[PDB]
Swiss-Prot record:
Its EC number is 1.7.-.-, 1.11.1.-. Disulfide bonds: none annotated. The keyword Metal-binding applies. This is Myoglobin. Nitrite binds at Y65.
């Protein structure tokens, strides 16, 4: 797939708002993911024992990971599709060490779109949400193709 420059503009305009508070957005997104799809919390040995949202909110480890995820994804989005280098080490670790099925990447993509819609309604109208969705589909598609080269396709 290929996004037009106007679609990348929409994606990078709302991402610039997320970047004013990377740790807060990271928390919201992961909590939305774990509340919606609790099976995903099991991949985290660091904090799969968390039982409630309150515990999740108070976890410093969870907030750190949120920053890790959003910083890596922000660097990929800013490439505007030229992200081959960035995707290599990510696809290897998620396919061979963590073992994250593509389906889980779809789940976190939904959680991102939900939180942007909640926090940034004025910069996340239908067109900007369609463009973010396209940017995340592109990301999943390219990661899925690398999983396959790596021997995992999950
Ligand atoms: C937007 C999508 C995602 C991005 C950009 C991302 C990025 C990262 C980065 C940069 C790391 C640390 C370096 C490395 O291990 O490669 C990491 C580690 C990890 N990721 Fe993610 N990730 C994403 C989705 C997921 C999902 C959906 C799951 C699980 C349901 C997952 C589970 C893990 C695990 C278990 C670790 C190890 C954490 C540790 O113990 O510190 N990732 N991820």
């Amino acid at each position: 797939m290929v996004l037009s420059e106007g679609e990348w503009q929409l994606v990078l305009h709302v991402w610039a708002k997320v970047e004013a508070d990377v740790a807060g957005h990271g928390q919201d997104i992961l909590i939305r993911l774990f509340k919606s799809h609790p099976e995903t919390l099991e991949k985290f040995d660091r904090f799969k024992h968390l039982k409630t949202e309150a515990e999740m909110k108070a976890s410093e480890d969870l907030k750190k990971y949120g920053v890790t995820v959003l910083t890596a994804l922000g660097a990929i989005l800013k490439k505007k599709g030229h992200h081959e280098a960035e995707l290599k080490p990510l696809a290897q670790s998620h396919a061979t060490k963590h073992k994250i099925p593509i389906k889980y990447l779809e789940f976190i993509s939904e959680a991102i779109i939900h939180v942007l819609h909640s926090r940034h309604p004025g910069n996340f109208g239908a067109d900007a949400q369609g463009a973010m969705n396209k940017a995340l589909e592109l990301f999943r598609k390219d990661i899925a193709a690398k999983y396959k080269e790596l021997g995992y396709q999950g």
